[PDB]
Design a protein around this motif. Structure first.
Motif, short mmCIF file in Angstrom:
data_model
loop_
_atom_site.label_atom_id
_atom_site.label_comp_id
_atom_site.label_asym_id
_atom_site.label_seq_id
_atom_site.Cartn_x
_atom_site.Cartn_y
_atom_site.Cartn_z
N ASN A 1 36.89 5.40 10.91
CA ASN A 1 37.59 4.61 9.90
C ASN A 1 39.07 4.44 10.25
O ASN A 1 39.79 5.42 10.44
CB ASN A 1 37.41 5.24 8.52
N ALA A 66 40.09 9.85 0.94
CA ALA A 66 38.74 9.97 1.50
C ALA A 66 38.53 9.04 2.68
O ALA A 66 38.68 7.82 2.55
CB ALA A 66 37.70 9.69 0.44
N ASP A 67 38.20 9.62 3.83
CA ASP A 67 37.84 8.89 5.05
C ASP A 67 38.96 8.10 5.73
O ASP A 67 38.72 7.47 6.75
CB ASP A 67 36.65 7.95 4.80
#
Ligand code: NAD
Ligand code: NAD
Ligand code: 5VD
Ligand code: 5VD
Ligand code: MG
Lengths: 289, 289
Positions: A1, A66-67
């Motif tokens: 990512n 997140a990510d």
């Protein structure tokens, strides 16, 4: 990512960083307290993903990260929580990055934070820098100088047909300035070149001018006479129209005694598009009120 | 002239200093913003000379220092002008002392000011210390620790028959404390022994206790059960009933990670009457609310 989480995305530094990141081809996730504002909807329309959270809410920060590959970290002290809140927020962003496996934090501090300035809102940033360093999270620190963008709301007024720049500076005081757009450029550049930028701290300026020179720039553009006038530090400190006026007066006194120390030529070699004050005036289309 | 000007004379540190100076036969002059208050009138009734002035008014500070031998310098940060005002005021006292030929300033800072704490209201004081040294004003710096006196307004409450001390400390955190009366003693002592004290900085504590131990001291005096309970730093920072709660939370976090470092035994050798917390409780006649 490849996503970068941008804090303060609806503000000056964060907004500039969003634009630079999108142009460089990074997905951008924006931390917003309220996704229903005009500013938040504008971000979404530009292709930004919104996430709801608050710098005072550590759980919300971890969720926001997140990510993501990286985080752009910026805080303000001009709120009811003040300098203590700024400090805690900066350390909270660092802690949340450590807890969520963020690979790169770009933190925006301030020029001279490392030089024992004693300016209260510079010392907060230094304390945040030290915390990031202690956590071992890969970090780039940007240390911007005086925002050219400040002159949009705090520019000169016409007095008897002459534009007057009135600030708590001696006429000889040289001040380094940076266009917020360039803070964004350097943040985006750092994420895409971690070999160069991880572990680095870089003081940012695109111009250096005295008060009389600033006034001259406005006068030349406006086709009007212009002059600089020094305001006393005590008077500036007491101004009921300036939020955190005392801290700001401490800062201006530090401009007088010490000041910023970016290497402008070296920055221009890295970033040939680095903006001068004249460039800022042209980009915003500055007009006399 | 042996007169000492006491700033903050109606406050905790200044008031303690006035009492200690009177005990040593020093003439005392008190800086007051309003000489008509009950507190100011009580100073006058004690044989303390009043002078009208304000720490924000530099001219008034110079006038207040006319002919005095020494100045006790103290500032607060919990006012409308906040941390910035505290800093400017401390430097203003220093500048006025320099301008008027004051022979000795006793400045009250805070324990750990010299240890890069990052606590915003500690860094202000460090900046003031540095300014005094830069001017060459002959100076003693006192660095007090946690005021025992804080517990008068912020003492434990009874919950289901148990006194509860609830603070943002780990149960294991050791905190150094000082009775304000002893700050006054050291200030007066410094003026009367400049050979020892001019150029010196001294961290001040009369006791060192954990939260559970503080609770035990209250329980012992009141003859009832007592316990300590840790409050989270986030909760403390957000407390609407604590002024400058965010800065105070940063400070409590620093108590947890670092903390004060006075040499209590050495201080008690200098000042045998140095108060323990148990002493303070007895002296003020602390009672269950
Ligand atoms: N103006 C200057 O010349 C200058 C120069 C150097 C550094 N700085 C520093 O820049 C910082 C401010 O950056 P800016 O000018 O981009 O600020 P800004 O006021 O333009 O933007 C603040 C952003 O933060 C967001 N925000 C505020 N509180 C929040 C919270 N609790 N949770 C989540 N988001 C929140 C706002 O909504 C906004 O998006 C300050 O620390 C200042 O010291 C300013
Ligand atoms: N409470 C603690 O545990 C602790 C421990 C170490 C240091 N400190 C430091 O003690 C300092 C405060 O001292 P205190 O407890 O004696 O304060 P205080 O609030 O008891 O008294 C302040 C005094 O200053 C005067 N004052 C306020 N503003 C003024 C102005 N503009 N001009 C002139 N006089 C003014 C007030 O009238 C009063 O006399 C703070 O800087 C704090 O950080 C506190
Ligand atoms: C043209 O001058 C301004 O706009 C002034 C100005 C300038 C700065 C900051 C201000 O907040 C204001 C406003 O107080 C209005 C005014 C007049 O005082 C500021 O917060 C700041 C900052 O946090 C960090 C670094 C900086 O370099 C600065 C500044 O340079
Ligand atoms: C019993 O605990 C207290 O009284 C707390 C407390 C403690 C300190 C200070 C407070 O202002 C308060 C209040 O915020 C209520 C509370 C609960 O948070 C403070 O300003 C200070 C300071 O400037 C310098 C050094 C210090 O060591 C201190 C303190 O230790
Ligand atoms: Mg996206």
């Amino acid at each position: 990512n490849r996503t970068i989480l941008v804090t303060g995305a609806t503000g000056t530094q964060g907004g500039a960083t969003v634009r630079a990141l999108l142009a460089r081809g990074r997905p951008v996730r924006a931390l917003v307290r309220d996704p229903g504002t005009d500013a938040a909807r504008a971000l979404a329309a530009a292709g930004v993903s919104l996430v709801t959270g608050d710098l005072n809410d550590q759980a919300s920060l971890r969720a926001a990260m997140a990510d993501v590959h990286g985080v752009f970290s910026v805080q303000t002290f001009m709120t009811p929580g003040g300098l203590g809140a700024e400090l805690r927020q900066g350390r909270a962003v660092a802690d949340a990055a450590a807890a969520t496996g963020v690979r790169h934090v770009v933190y925006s501090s301030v020029g001279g934070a490392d030089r024992a300035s004693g300016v209260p809102h510079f010392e907060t940033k230094w304390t945040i820098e030290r915390h990031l360093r202690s956590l071992g999270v890969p970090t780039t620190v940007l240390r911007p100088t005086f925002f050219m963008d400040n002159f949009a709301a705090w520019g000169p007024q016409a007095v008897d047909g002459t534009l007057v720049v009135r600030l708590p500076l001696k006429p000889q005081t040289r001040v380094q300035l940076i266009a917020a757009e360039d803070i964004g450029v350097f943040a985006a550049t750092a994420f895409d070149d971690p070999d160069t930028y991880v572990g680095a701290a870089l003081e940012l300026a695109g111009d250096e001018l005295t008060g009389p020179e600033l006034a001259a720039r406005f006068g030349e553009l406006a086709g009007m006479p212009a002059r600089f006038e020094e305001r006393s530090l005590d008077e500036a400190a007491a101004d009921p129209w300036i939020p955190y006026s005392h801290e700001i007066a401490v800062m201006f006194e530090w401009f007088q005694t010490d000041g910023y120390a970016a290497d402008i030529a070296a920055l221009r070699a890295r970033h040939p598009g680095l903006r001068t004050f004249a460039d800022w005036l042209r980009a915003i289309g500055w007009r006399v009120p």
